[PDB]
Design a protein around this ligand. Structure first.
Ligand SMILES: CCCCCCCCCCCCCC(=O)O
Ligand SMILES: CCCCCCCCCCCCCC(=O)O
Lengths: 154, 154
């Protein structure tokens, strides 16, 4: 992944987002509702110090669970780390702050098209697809407005 | 689906095919290995009378099962019917006979990009994507050469 947002202002990604589309390098990362990177973003909360708290929903053990994870800043504004047994990088590819944000998680790769509202933004989906066409994605999902307003997009 | 192959010669689709990519209108048609339209084409056998026998693999009850289904001709060369409780149409969108064939199944919609060999044909995938961009697809899968040579693409 060699697309990152230049001049990212992480404070300006604060607030509500919708996981309109997702893609991953391996089918098994996204196939089932309980697949590992089937995560539905709810809210981004940048801290003062420029870390990024993330609220998301994740289907585990037969229900839609709310999770809170912190992505810690690096020396690159568009790149954050998530603390685990494995170090995973969050990369912000592109955003206009007021409509869409594209990001990928890499250790194997999953990316999403976030939008501010429960609407299919064809423009943002086009940019999503263009950013992905370089990458080895083998599964892509997208959600309708009804699904976007349900917990875990059921 | 308003793309069909003009001047289709069904005899010339005979032989070996590989389900390189699949897409569907609803995630639940393709998500799990045991999802309803997660079918992997093996061989097409047009009959003299211009019906189309299809050999495919389908994961059911914890194993990769071989299935044989017959798609019966209609008055349109590019359109076939599969006998069930519901009448389902097979539509041949496009083929060059020697490398790729695009088709959709509709009752809700699933389409595939078939190829003659266990190779990622970017050209055929591009035509697949272009044919789909009109249609309301919410899941897309594609397989690597290793997977293509395994039963049920495991
Ligand atoms: C700028 C937006 C970045 C959003 C990143 C979401 C990262 C998801 C982390 C991987 C999934 C964690 C699920 C879990 O808690 O086990
Ligand atoms: C020209 C190529 C057309 C290939 C059509 C494959 C159609 C698959 C039929 C639907 C799945 C049947 C699975 C089953 O036997 O229950």
């Amino acid at each position: 992944v060699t697309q990152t947002m230049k001049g990212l202002d992480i404070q300006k990604v604060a607030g509500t987002w919708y996981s309109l589309a997702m893609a991953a390098s391996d089918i098994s990362l996204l196939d089932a509702q309980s697949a590992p990177l089937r995560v539905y973003v709810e809210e981004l909360k940048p801290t003062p110090e420029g870390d990024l708290e993330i609220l998301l929903q994740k289907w585990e053990n037969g229900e839609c669970a709310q999770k809170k994870i912190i992505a810690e800043k690096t020396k690159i504004p568009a790149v954050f780390k998530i603390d685990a047994l494995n170090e995973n990088k969050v990369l912000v590819l592109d955003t206009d702050y007021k409509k869409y944000l594209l990001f990928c998680l890499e250790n194997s790769l999953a990316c999403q098209c976030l939008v501010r509202t429960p609407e299919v933004d064809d423009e943002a989906l086009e940019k999503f697809d263009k950013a992905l066409k370089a990458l080895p994605m083998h599964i892509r999902l997208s959600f309708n407005p009804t699904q976007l307003e349900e917990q875990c997009h059921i």
